[PDB]
Design a protein around this ligand. Sequence first.
Ligand SMILES: CCCCCCCC/C=C\CCCCCCCC(=O)O[C@H](COC(=O)CCCCCCCCCCCCCCC)COP(=O)(O)OCCN
Ligand SMILES: CC(C)CCC[C@@H](C)[C@H]1CC[C@H]2[C@@H]3CC=C4C[C@@H](OC(=O)CCC(=O)O)CC[C@]4(C)[C@H]3CC[C@]12C
Ligand SMILES: CC(C)CCC[C@@H](C)[C@H]1CC[C@H]2[C@@H]3CC=C4C[C@@H](OC(=O)CCC(=O)O)CC[C@]4(C)[C@H]3CC[C@]12C
Ligand SMILES: CC(C)CCC[C@@H](C)[C@H]1CC[C@H]2[C@@H]3CC=C4C[C@@H](OC(=O)CCC(=O)O)CC[C@]4(C)[C@H]3CC[C@]12C
Ligand SMILES: CC(C)CCC[C@@H](C)[C@H]1CC[C@H]2[C@@H]3CC=C4C[C@@H](OC(=O)CCC(=O)O)CC[C@]4(C)[C@H]3CC[C@]12C
Ligand SMILES: *[C@@H]1O[C@H](CO)[C@@H](O)[C@H](O)[C@H]1NC(C)=O
Lengths: 104, 420
Amino acid sequence: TRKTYAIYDLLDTAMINNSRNLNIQLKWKRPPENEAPPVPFLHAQRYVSGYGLQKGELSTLLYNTHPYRAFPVLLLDTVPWYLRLYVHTLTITSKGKENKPSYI
Amino acid sequence: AAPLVLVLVVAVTVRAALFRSSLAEFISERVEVVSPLSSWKRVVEGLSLLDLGVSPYSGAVFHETPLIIYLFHFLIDYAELVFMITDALTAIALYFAIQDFNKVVFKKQKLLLELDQYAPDVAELIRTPMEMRYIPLKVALFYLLNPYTILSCVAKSTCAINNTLIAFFILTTIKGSAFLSAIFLALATYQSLYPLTLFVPGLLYLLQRQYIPVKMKSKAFWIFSWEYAMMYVGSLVVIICLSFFLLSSWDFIPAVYGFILSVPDLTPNIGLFWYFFAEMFEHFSLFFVCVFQINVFFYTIPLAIKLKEHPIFFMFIQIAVIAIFKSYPTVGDVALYMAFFPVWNHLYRFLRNIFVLTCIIIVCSLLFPVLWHLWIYAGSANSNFFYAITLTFNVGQILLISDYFYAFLRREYYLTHGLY
Ligand SMILES: CCCCCCCC/C=C\CCCCCCCC(=O)O[C@H](COC(=O)CCCCCCCCCCCCCCC)COP(=O)(O)OCCN
Ligand SMILES: CC(C)CCC[C@@H](C)[C@H]1CC[C@H]2[C@@H]3CC=C4C[C@@H](OC(=O)CCC(=O)O)CC[C@]4(C)[C@H]3CC[C@]12C
Ligand SMILES: CC(C)CCC[C@@H](C)[C@H]1CC[C@H]2[C@@H]3CC=C4C[C@@H](OC(=O)CCC(=O)O)CC[C@]4(C)[C@H]3CC[C@]12C
Ligand SMILES: CC(C)CCC[C@@H](C)[C@H]1CC[C@H]2[C@@H]3CC=C4C[C@@H](OC(=O)CCC(=O)O)CC[C@]4(C)[C@H]3CC[C@]12C
Ligand SMILES: CC(C)CCC[C@@H](C)[C@H]1CC[C@H]2[C@@H]3CC=C4C[C@@H](OC(=O)CCC(=O)O)CC[C@]4(C)[C@H]3CC[C@]12C
Ligand SMILES: *[C@@H]1O[C@H](CO)[C@@H](O)[C@H](O)[C@H]1NC(C)=O
């Protein structure tokens, strides 16, 4: 996104020198709902499915918020040895239908 | 026979109904019914791993032999049909084995009756064809309709397959067939290491059937024993070497036999090894695991000493000891030696402490799921509750087996010396 930045060159004597300190004050409050920026195109959350101390599921939700563009993603999972995984139970369901990863 | 067909039909119908029920998933995940070496989910996982190019023995989930993976590669479909067929085949093998054993023991009894070797008045202890008519049918009925076996086959555990192998070993041994008995014993030793202890009962029964005196000075005994031992060892070596080539690697030997002998999982079971090694000082871990795995093979020789002339009871006691002291015991393993109870039900009059032990076994079995749920899902119980249940269950099993052994000894003593 096109972002505008204000530069405070500390190497400039005309900005900060021995005669004064610099204290940048910014006025910012939470914008109203109308002025809120759009949600980022990619975000994800992770959680554990089920209850008890015998079995469960490590579920990851991957959100694509782009209205019309689909992009690949690369998911990396590292699970310790005491959480014995069964790869035959690995399901990737997007929009309610099975999704086949390009590379597993 | 018609009653055998009726029992087979009833058992198959019950198994199919439980297969199509909503309790199949609940049963499939029971720690009492499945084990790290026998779970069906692990078979599916090890089959799926091969599709990814990953050797199934590189992980810590798959612990089954290459023969199982070859069988279930072709037969991944119709798995429930496969397990129902294995249960029916075990029932058939046990039925015919016991039917032949009854004839053999009746011929022996008639021989010592003609020789008047028994006591003058032991008519009550005398076995009659009328009482032995339905023993083969009851043997197949105590296995097919056992709740343990029904659960073990609905959960789709390879324990049913290993039980079928042991049953066919018993049948072939009872029907002569030294070659087939050696092959089936090698196959049983392939799936689980412990069934190698049945070598002594099989050899003793074969020698008795072939009328070779089991004496140190005897040479025919040594010749036949050497042939049987060589046949068994060759059949096991050939199986190991052949199944090496399935994945062209030796990694299955650790994942199966080192798993069986070293107990790395420490996952709850009806056994006595899960907690002993979870709650254990690492100083004596090797010593105590060595002692506990010696325990299974400990009694075969002294039992052979006492039961030299009674090899089938020796085999039954050995099967029971294996099922009790296995590293990863299963209710399916326990159900194999409870199919022999109708054979030894003529020992009932000399059986003490039968009601209490049966009640204890029933209580422990019903209490396994309840206390497991309280510990794991409810959270209001510890592992101590489940450990206590396993202790009580195994004590009941041990006392029941020793009780049948005592009844057998009492009957032999009365037959020899005189009942009052
Ligand atoms: C399904 C998940 C959990 C279910 C748990 C159930 C599993 C229990 C399975 C096996 C446990 C059995 C262990 C001991 C087996 C004894 C073998 C046996 O046959 O001994 C027999 C003796 O039987 C007994 O003494 C035991 C009976 C006394 C108590 C049992 C009956 C009450 C229990 C019922 C509770 C449940 C009822 C529900 C509806 C049935 C010998 O009989 P016999 O020799 O034929 O008599 C004629 C004499 N010539
Ligand atoms: C292999 C031994 C040591 C242990 C397993 C027991 C076998 C003797 C049994 C158990 C399951 C049986 C199988 C169960 C199902 C079938 C399918 C059946 O054919 C079909 O129904 C296929 C139909 C189709 O494919 O269209 C042929 C027999 C077969 C292979 C059976 C052959 C004998 C098997 C392997
Ligand atoms: C069944 C009875 C009659 C013995 C038969 C002996 C051979 C058929 C087998 C049994 C054990 C096998 C061995 C078991 C373990 C290994 C380690 C293996 O090396 C590894 O990959 C390391 C494995 C590890 O230790 O974790 C090479 C094959 C070898 C020597 C095997 C070679 C073939 C052996 C000797
Ligand atoms: C079909 C039957 C007759 C096979 C008989 C062979 C087994 C008795 C052998 C074959 C492979 C052996 C296992 C190979 C590797 C290990 C790991 C080892 O633990 C370690 O990692 C320690 C290594 C070290 O001490 O340096 C403990 C013994 C054990 C389970 C061995 C126990 C004995 C096993 C199961
Ligand atoms: C194979 C049959 C015919 C022989 C009888 C087997 C048992 C009586 C004993 C003999 C040697 C023992 C093994 C010797 C060495 C080891 C390595 C040992 O490795 C470890 O230290 C890891 C396990 C742990 O320490 O808890 C595990 C036990 C084990 C497999 C032992 C298990 C019990 C065994 C197989
Ligand atoms: C830099 O120093 C001079 C001399 O003291 C001072 O007048 C000037 O204000 C200083 N710069 C800034 C940005 O204040």
